[PDB]
Amino acid sequence: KSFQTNVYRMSKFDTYIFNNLYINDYKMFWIDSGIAKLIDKNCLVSYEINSSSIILLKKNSIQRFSLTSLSDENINVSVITISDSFIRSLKSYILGDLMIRNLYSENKDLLLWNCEHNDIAVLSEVVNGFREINYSDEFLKVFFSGFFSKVEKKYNSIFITDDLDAMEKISCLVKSDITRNWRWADICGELRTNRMILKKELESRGVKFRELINSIRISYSISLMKTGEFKIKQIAYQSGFASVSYFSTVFKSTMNVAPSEYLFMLT
């Protein structure tokens, strides 16, 4: 209930490409074997990852990156999405060393951690739905809080962001009424904050207002598909779009696949 997991297949030189992918909850992913090339267009860097490389994606970030297989054998990419309720049950473990956390920055939204075998084992059983070694809530809180702490320490940057951060307020507001016809005036009035102030959250992420709203609605539609909802026409309108055609165009530009192709990837 605290984790949502998926496994995707990559064949030889296959490439997943994401543009303006809004991260609605903390995510992490890794490959099970072989070598892959990760190109991060936000940080203008590229590097190779292996079966020990764990990639962390920060909540409320807007991602622009590609992942390419460099291996002959088929690669499985495992993606874990961590629920906000679980993340908040961690706020007592992290923040328990808080004024050392005050000296951190907040630029990095895509982090890399080279882990050992036991980390992969715990994370793999999470993706397996806890069907073999089940874990207690205490073990998982200690494991994940310790994991985030040492990755934050490595980059000297905040990963678990605070609840009163401006982009979190904007995101939670849009997600609480996804079909509302959002405009700048609605955000300013609900947050009682000047547009000169809120616009910094969009500029530092490289998005206009419509692309921000569109990106949140796309990640909303992805959560809907993950529940087993299969009717694309329903998903388009449930996510707040005005037409199936516009939803599919925005989805394709974000995910590089048509909505129906991703829905089948989830099975």
For ligand 70H, the binding residues (CB under 6 A) are 6, 8, 16, 27, 29, 67, 77, 79, 81, 222
What's the closest the beta carbon of residue 188 comes to ligand 70H, in angstroms?
A: 29
What's the closest the beta carbon of residue 138 comes to ligand 70H, in angstroms?
A: 27
What's the closest the beta carbon of residue 64 comes to ligand 70H, in angstroms?
A: 12
Give the integer Cα–Cα distance in Å for 38 and 20: 16
**Residues 84-98 as b or e (16 or more Cβ within 10 Å = b):** eebbebbeeebeeee
For residues 79 and 166, which CB has a smaller minimum distance to ligand 70H in the complex?
A: 79
For residues 198 and 219, which CB has a smaller minimum distance to ligand 70H in the complex?
A: 219
For residues 110 and 187, which CB has a smaller minimum distance to ligand 70H in the complex?
A: 110
What's the closest the beta carbon of residue 79 comes to ligand 70H, in angstroms?
A: 5
For residues 149 and 219, which CB has a smaller minimum distance to ligand 70H in the complex?
A: 219
For residues 6 and 71, which CB has a smaller minimum distance to ligand 70H in the complex?
A: 6
What's the closest the beta carbon of residue 81 comes to ligand 70H, in angstroms?
A: 6
User: Would you call 214 exposed, middle or buried from its count of C-beta atoms within 10 A (0-12, 13-18, 19+)?
Assistant: buried
The tokens describing 260, both together, are 């129906």
Using DSSP's 3-state secondary structure scheme, residue 92 falls into coil
For residues 187 and 241, which CB has a smaller minimum distance to ligand 70H in the complex?
A: 241
What's the closest the beta carbon of residue 265 comes to ligand 70H, in angstroms?
A: 7
Judge contact between 196 and 166, C-beta under 8 A.
no
For residue 34, give the DSSP letter: S
For residue 105, give the DSSP letter: B
The tokens describing 189, both together, are 């009035």
Judge contact between 94 and 57, C-beta under 8 A.
no
Taking residue 113's Cβ as centre, other Cβ atoms within 10 Å add up to 18
The tokens describing 83, both together, are 């629920």
